[PDB]
Amino acid sequence: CEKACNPRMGNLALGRKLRADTMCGQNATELFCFYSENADLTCRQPKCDKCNAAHSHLAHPPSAMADSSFRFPRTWWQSAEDVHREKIQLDLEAEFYFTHLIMVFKSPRPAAMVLDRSQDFGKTWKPYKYFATNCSATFGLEDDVVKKGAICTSRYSNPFPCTGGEVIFRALSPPYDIENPYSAKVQEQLKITNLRVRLLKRQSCPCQINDLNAKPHHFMHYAVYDFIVKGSCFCNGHADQCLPVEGFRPIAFHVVHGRCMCKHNTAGSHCQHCAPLYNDRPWEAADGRTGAPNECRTCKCNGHADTCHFDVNVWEASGNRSGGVCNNCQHNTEGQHCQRCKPGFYRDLRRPFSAPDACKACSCHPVGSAILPFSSVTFCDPSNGDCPCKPGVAGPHCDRCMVGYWGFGDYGCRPCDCAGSCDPLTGDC
Template sequence: MNAAEVPVPPTGDLLVGRSGQLTASSTCGLDRAQKYCILSYLEGEQKCFICDSRFPYDPHTQPNSHTIENVITSFEPEREKKWWQSENGVTKFLYNLLFLHIFSLDHVSIRLDLEVLFQLSHLILTFKTFRPAAMLVERSTDYGHTWRVFKYFAKDCAASFPNITSGQAQGVGDVVCDSKYSDIEPSTGGEVVLKVLDPSFEIENPYSPYIQDLVTLTNLRINFTRLHTLGDTLLGRKQNDSLNKYYYALYEMVVLGSCFCNGHASECGSAQKTRGDVFSPPSMVHGRCICQHKTDGPNCERCKDFFQDASYGPPGQCLPSGGLSGGVGDDCPQNTEGQHCDGCRPLFSRDPLKAISDPYACIPCECDPDGTISGGLCVSHSDPDLGSVTGRSLCKENVEGAKCDRCKPNHYGLSAADPLGCQLKANKVYQCEEVRMRTTMYDVLSACACHPLGSLPLLPCD
């Protein structure tokens, strides 16, 4: 099974069918109707509106409801009339008899809780208002117990995230701060895009544990940490209308991903007794892998009963337990062999830069079969103690070259039928010299009476 044959489940929007698993820490109008305004230079005569999210959005009866499920992609007409919106932000003033308390409402989070482990590809956010001046995206692989950051975004990375490297990542998995998606323009319709695996880096083995750890998650959290403002929020309580103009608002959120099956499934089904909408839409990405290759488990992470792990991970396979394969490796993938499929077949050698689970871990020997022992064999793996190097050809006695494809000096006629590979040239001086090396002087004189200056070409030495 080569790389092209590794089954890949289809990718889709993980939000579809999971509105009940999407939450926001702040939503306008949840407890009571709230006033909000737009910037005065934006088009339209009306500048202030009412948000009332006590009931779900309905274009006819509840057009002012801006709950978080509004961000899930739909193909309704006039889609731009539906969005999620946080409470008015920046600062909140609370007075008691002695003190003025100021609370920041810049910090708002959106969270998606998945029922099983999934694989994430892209996150795309389309904003109705300014994009955040600063934000970060986190993930959890243990259902929210611990969190790790995917990426930071900020207009001023040094000010917002002073301990984080800014600019271009230097390698796959580097956590950096990106300023590309945090400018104050455009004022509406701006996007923030997260690509989990940076396409500028080549990934040799997408099934390595390191790469799999980078792309999997059970929970996704987006933290907005700073709003863009125009400098009118510092004027105090008398300018309360200025505070009503600043909040986070999203038209759409797309979480592209697939079920995570360790390369052992091409489709996934719905899991029983798991969270999700009551009626699953046709485009919903389910999380229960329909496993192939004798694998089992929610993510095809183990072998079925009576099968054993054979260098697990694509294109690794599960073989019958008890040595039923006889160690021959007939069921081993892509030019591997052995009871655990951890060696290369004859006429192949191990690429030292690839894991044995890689589809191209065993590469063909580049040896001339006429000049090598056993018709093209090469060293299958390196052994420093023996001084052997993987891929090196095993030449016959009178043959040389990295590929055993030429005769040694003063030899000719490379042939598969010749056990030495090549014959000594028909020059009696050379023939007699070779004879002298292998026999006594008496044998030489009796077997080959050669002229001191050499015999004529092609004359037998008898």
């Protein structure tokens, strides 16, 4: 995934549970009929059949909308008899991009219905598009067939055709197809966790029943062949392939998954984060317009840290060039970039600094080593490991009397008046 990228588009309906308030034949078996019209608007002979939820070959559950839209016999969900207020809802186990919807009614399309989304797993909902035979009379909204931008539409509400009639909504409206698809403005429109259809009123086939040997009956019910929800895994443009989301058990389908295989040194379920060691500059979504990747930059830690965090104060201090700060410096290092050895250690020039043994422990003798005020312990020079010795004490470790001194002790070494080479133990010449 070199440049800005995106996973494959697909029907989010597949593999997931579509829910509906009701379905025909909930209790016992039920006779049901369908009525459509021909060119002369005369009612056709109604195909009738039995419905029963307990049996697969008679049931019409909501899941019949999420199945393949091209199988041997067409399948459809069918609500209980005599119901107007109905709701179809699709809950997603993660955040996905929703681009455009296609419903396909077997019965006549509803005289009124609305579509909306939840961006926060069902806590809140916000409209997408209203549908009615008259937007002004039903919802007090303008019709987009005239207003060219309205939120309501009668384009998909005509009783004819009484069967196979489709309802459609496209999130990628003229304003949203241009510009960067990952911008804040577009995410507001595309990103969703749920998708809900609320049917408000049924619609009877207004065809002429002249050729009918019997009056219409057992038809007051909703019916939908397919609930095609085109969309894709959301990854902020830092991925082109997704795996299953943790804890998700799907139900002959081509399922769309949500867990992003993140690229561009990003991380998180949707690449919203930077990789743990790549917080040197602020995260940013890939630019679909520009095609720019906007990939996370690594922190400099000299190989003494595997994690780091951004810092706006350090960021501005560098001149907006770098702001990473290494977390939990390993190998006895200390710096912001783990670039120095801690006190009580020093640079081992024999080794490279990136090496684990870059810093070597100090061997300052506790008694022979002098201590500075406002400190209770001696630490060696980090550059060469030389400890500051008390008077008369010598060496890099201050662990023995200087030449010409004796009586190693907590106050250094006494000068031997030989003078003359000393025996450091007794002071004899």
